[PDB]
Every structure is written in structure tokens, then in C-alpha cells.
């Protein structure tokens, strides 16, 4: 069948929940409470976390904010649908899907 | 660019505001934030939202 | 008539703040306090309705 | 009158403003854009 | 072979959209501040404006929709730490 | 009418992307060779990464 290792059809990308960074196994990364969780990136939570929930689904704020400012570094001053020329094929946003 | 371009030290980059106060009518309700933007800092209206 | 009916639990503010350098943004919030530098916006529709 | 005081003519956004935060603005454009919280009047 | 004598009816349909009149010579948009608002006729004196509208009928009560589109600006200066004061003009139709 | 008492369920989907996640101080793109490459913090020394 199809090899996304090879031609890039990837599909898993909703089976995360936490990533956590450290250096030197001592210091964490960013730190400086950056984010809600001073301590990981929380991918998504379930019902019980649902004061960090966005756009009507269960990823956080942070996470979503993360991933537009990576994209199309939008933000910090609103968020809003980034151009069609800037949002390509493999972007992002463009394959982002809210179900319920 | 390496400097003057974003601070180094600890700040939060969102804020989470709890009423101070809620009124309640039969139609309608009414709620009351105190936003206090922080020294060396600038908020962008924008950004916010309920 | 038809029953629907509608509750609001918990309301809260948000607001995300650019991590700018301390030196850079007194510098800006200090040269945004002048008149001449004053904040000016216009409603895009900006009409008058009857 | 008060027209120029509400920036409905005269100079533009880039006239009006203090030299320094001109050359601020430009200097960040794609970091913190300013140029939208500014009139600029466009008389016929 | 057997088609009957007819008549034409002709209409068109236009939604989302506001009939424009510009208050200009030419009607075209060469600015927000257009030529005839800066005339000096209605720069200094005042005038008495009265319109009247031919529409074709319903059933029902309707409402007829006018939007004098005039400048709306804010001017917001912030001296100190914590104290923000604004101004606002509307002009004309001023409050 | 005979509605029953229900819970919701709320997931998404994202596919043909890659999660990212850019090693600079506030998550922007402002270049190739980010500010934190060239802060001499990792310039100098090693570390060990888990």
C-alpha cells in the first residue's frame, strides 16, 4: 500500500497527548512557565480538562497556539484564516477537522 | 535577530481572568473583570476574547 | 414556545501576551504615551441607520 | 477644523507620527505590526 | 409545430448587496472624502433633504433600510499608567 | 420528545502535517538559524537530551 515514511501520507497525528522536553534531565524546556503546564506540552485532554479546550474539541489552547505561530505565525495579534497562498497542501490548517 | 527582540526572563504568555463580580437579570446577566496588564508588557485587544 | 432554553455556567476572560524584551516594550509604551502618537481607528461600515 | 485633528485629511499615518516610532514601526513589521491602528485619510 | 402565441416577462435578482448612490459629480470613488462633501455649498449652510421611494407592494409590513454612510472616528490618547480617554466624531449626523 | 439523556464526545483530525515544534524563545519563525541556535548557552557546551 501506500508508504507515508516515504511520501509523506501521514495519519496518526491525533493518537498524541503529552510531549515533555528536558535538558540534562534536570531543566525543563521552554520553562519559564511559558505555557499553562509549566512543565510539558499537553497535546489534548479529555472532558475533565475542559477549561484549556479550543475551538469546540479536546486540544488545549496552548497547543493550538503553538502550532499556528510554527505555521504562519499568527497569534499573538488574533487569530483569524491565514491567505490561501500561505496555507498549502500540507499545511496545517488546512486538513485541521472539529468533530463531535 | 538575537536581541531586543523578546525577553529572556520567566513571563506567562496567556492569562486567564475570573470575574470579580456576576449580576443576573431574567434576560440578560452582566459580568466584571479587573484586566491588569502587567508592568513591561503590551496587550494587544485583539487577542482577547470571552 | 417550543421549549429551547439556554444556560450559561462559568464565564472567563483571556489574553495572550507578545513575550517581548523589557527594554524594548518600556521604550515603546513610553513613546506611545505621547499625543502626537495617539491610537486612531474608523468603523468600516460607518453609516448612520434609520 | 477638526477634521486634520481626526485625521479625516491632511497628512497620513507615516507624517503625523513621531520620527522615532516611524522608524520603530517599520523596523518590526512582521513581528508586531502597528500601521493598522493608525488613519490614513484619502481625500479626492 | 403547435406552439401557442406567448408574451415575455423579465426580471433579475440581486441579494447580499445595498443599492449605492456616491455622493459625487462623476459617481465614481476617488476617495473617502469625496469631492462634493468638501464643496463649499454644503460646507457652510444647512439644507433640508427629502426622499421619496416607489416600490412595489406585499402583503406584509416591511421596513425600508437607509444608511447615510458618513465618517466615523475614534481618537483614544492614554497619558498616564492606567487612565485611557477617547474622543468620538461622527460627522455629519453628529450627536 | 422522547429524547434520551446523552453525553458528547469531541475528538479531530489532522492528517498530511506534521506536528511542529519550533526551538525558539516565542514559538515564531523569524529565520532559518533561530535565536536560540546562536545563543552561546548551546554554543559552547554539550547536553543530553531525553
Same mark, same amino acid.
Given at each position: ?30 520553562? @519559564? ?5 509549566? @512543565? *510539558? ?8 480538562? *475542559? ?19 510554527? @505555521?504562519? @505565525? ?27 | ?50 | ?50 | ?44 | ?5 406567448? =408574451?415575455? +416577462? ?10 449605492? =448612490? ?15 462633501? +468638501? ?21 406584509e409590513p416591511t421596513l425600508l433600510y437607509v444608511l447615510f454612510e458618513v465618517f466615523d472616528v475614534v481618537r483614544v490618547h492614554r497619558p498616564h499608567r492606567g487612565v485611557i480617554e477617547t474622543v468620538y466624531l461622527r460627522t455629519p449626523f453628529s450627536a
Amino acid at each position: 500500500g501506500s508508504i507515508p515514511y516515504l511520501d509523506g501520507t501521514f495519519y496518526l497525528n491525533h493518537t498524541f497527548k503529552k510531549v515533555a522536553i528536558t535538558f540534562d534531565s534536570s531543566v525543563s524546556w521552554p520553562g @519559564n512557565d511559558r505555557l499553562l503546564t509549566p @512543565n *510539558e506540552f499537553e497535546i489534548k485532554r479529555s472532558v475533565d480538562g *475542559e477549561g484549556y479546550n479550543v475551538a469546540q474539541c479536546n486540544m488545549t489552547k496552548d497547543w493550538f497556539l503553538v502550532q499556528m505561530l510554527a @505555521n504562519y @505565525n499568527i497569534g499573538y495579534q488574533g487569530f483569524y484564516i491565514p491567505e490561501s497562498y500561505k496555507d498549502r497542501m500540507y499545511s496545517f490548517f488546512r486538513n485541521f477537522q472539529p468533530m463531535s | 535577530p538575537t536581541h531586543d527582540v523578546t525577553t529572556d526572563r520567566s513571563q506567562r504568555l496567556t492569562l486567564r481572568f475570573i470575574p470579580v463580580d456576576r449580576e443576573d437579570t431574567a434576560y440578560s446577566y452582566k459580568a466584571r473583570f479587573t484586566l491588569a496588564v502587567g508592568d513591561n508588557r503590551v496587550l494587544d485587544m485583539a487577542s482577547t476574547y470571552f | 414556545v417550543d421549549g429551547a432554553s439556554i444556560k450559561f455556567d462559568s464565564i472567563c476572560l483571556y489574553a495572550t501576551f507578545f513575550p517581548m524584551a523589557h527594554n524594548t516594550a518600556s521604550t515603546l509604551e513610553a513613546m506611545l504615551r505621547n499625543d502626537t502618537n495617539d491610537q486612531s481607528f474608523n468603523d468600516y461600515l460607518s453609516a448612520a441607520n434609520m | 477644523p477638526q477634521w486634520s485633528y481626526m485625521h479625516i485629511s491632511g497628512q497620513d499615518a507615516s507624517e503625523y507620527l513621531s520620527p522615532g516610532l516611524v522608524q520603530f514601526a517599520r523596523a518590526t513589521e512582521t513581528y508586531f505590526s502597528l500601521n493598522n491602528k493608525f488613519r490614513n485619510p484619502t481625500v479626492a | 409545430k403547435t406552439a401557442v402565441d406567448s =408574451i415575455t +416577462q423579465k426580471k433579475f435578482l440581486c441579494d447580499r448587496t445595498l443599492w449605492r =448612490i456616491p455622493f459625487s459629480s462623476n459617481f465614481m470613488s476617488m476617495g473617502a472624502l469625496t469631492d462634493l462633501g +468638501q464643496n463649499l455649498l454644503y460646507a457652510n449652510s444647512a439644507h433640508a433633504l427629502d426622499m421619496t421611494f416607489e416600490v412595489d407592494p406585499m402583503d406584509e409590513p416591511t421596513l425600508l433600510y437607509v444608511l447615510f454612510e458618513v465618517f466615523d472616528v475614534v481618537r483614544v490618547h492614554r497619558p498616564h499608567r492606567g487612565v485611557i480617554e477617547t474622543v468620538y466624531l461622527r460627522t455629519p449626523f453628529s450627536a
